Curated annotation (Swiss-Prot):
This is Major prion protein. It comes from Homo sapiens (Human). Changing G3V: Protective factor against Kuru; protective factor against prion disease; confers protection against classical Creutzfeldt-Jakob disease (CJD) and Kuru in the heterozygous state but can be infected with variant CJD prions resulting from exposure to bovine spongiform encephalopathy prions; confers complete resistance to all prion strains when homozygous; acts as a 'dominant negative' inhibitor of prion conversion; is not only itself resistant to conformational conversion, but also inhibits conversion of wild-type proteins. The chain holds residues 125 to 231 of 253 of the full protein. Monomer and homodimer. Has a tendency to aggregate into amyloid fibrils containing a cross-beta spine, formed by a steric zipper of superposed beta-strands. Soluble oligomers may represent an intermediate stage on the path to fibril formation. Copper binding may promote oligomerization. Interacts with GRB2, APP, ERI3/PRNPIP and SYN1. Mislocalized cytosolically exposed PrP interacts with MGRN1; this interaction alters MGRN1 subcellular location and causes lysosomal enlargement. Interacts with KIAA1191. Interacts with ADGRG6. Its primary physiological function is unclear. May play a role in neuronal development and synaptic plasticity. May be required for neuronal myelin sheath maintenance. May promote myelin homeostasis through acting as an agonist for ADGRG6 receptor. May play a role in iron uptake and iron homeostasis. Soluble oligomers are toxic to cultured neuroblastoma cells and induce apoptosis (in vitro). Association with GPC1 (via its heparan sulfate chains) targets PRNP to lipid rafts. Also provides Cu(2+) or Zn(2+) for the ascorbate-mediated GPC1 deaminase degradation of its heparan sulfate side chains.
Length: 107
C-alpha cells in the first residue's frame, strides 16, 4: 500500500463563493481548480471536525509538487479560493457525511 488515494474527478465544479468581486477571478481559477485529494493516517489525533480541515491542508501541501508541472506559483488569494474547492471535495468522496448536514440544523 502506498497512500495516494484516488476517486476520479468531481461533478459540478461550480463552488459557492458569495463575493461578486472574487467571482471575476474565480472564473479563471475554476479552470485550474483542484481535482485530486490525498490524506495520510498520520492525521488522526483530533476531533472529527479538525480531521476534515486537516485533510484539506494535506492536499494543498502535496499540491506544491504538481505545481511544477506548470512551473508557476500560487498567491494568498488564489490558494484561498482553491482551499474552498478542496473542502467540498473531501465530502464528495462520501455523501453519508453531507446526509447529516441536511438533517437538522443544530450549530
Amino acid at each position: 500500500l502506498g497512500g495516494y488515494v484516488l476517486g476520479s474527478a468531481m461533478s459540478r465544479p461550480i463552488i459557492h463563493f458569495g463575493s461578486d468581486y472574487e467571482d471575476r477571478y474565480y472564473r479563471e481559477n475554476m479552470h485550474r481548480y483542484p481535482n485530486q485529494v490525498y490524506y495520510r493516517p498520520m492525521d488522526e489525533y483530533s476531533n472529527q471536525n479538525n480531521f476534515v480541515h486537516n485533510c484539506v491542508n494535506i492536499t494543498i501541501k502535496q499540491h506544491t509538487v504538481t505545481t511544477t508541472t506548470k512551473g508557476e506559483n500560487f498567491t494568498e488569494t488564489d490558494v484561498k479560493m482553491m482551499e474552498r474547492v478542496v473542502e467540498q471535495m473531501c465530502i464528495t468522496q462520501y455523501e453519508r457525511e453531507s446526509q447529516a448536514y441536511y438533517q437538522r440544523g443544530s450549530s
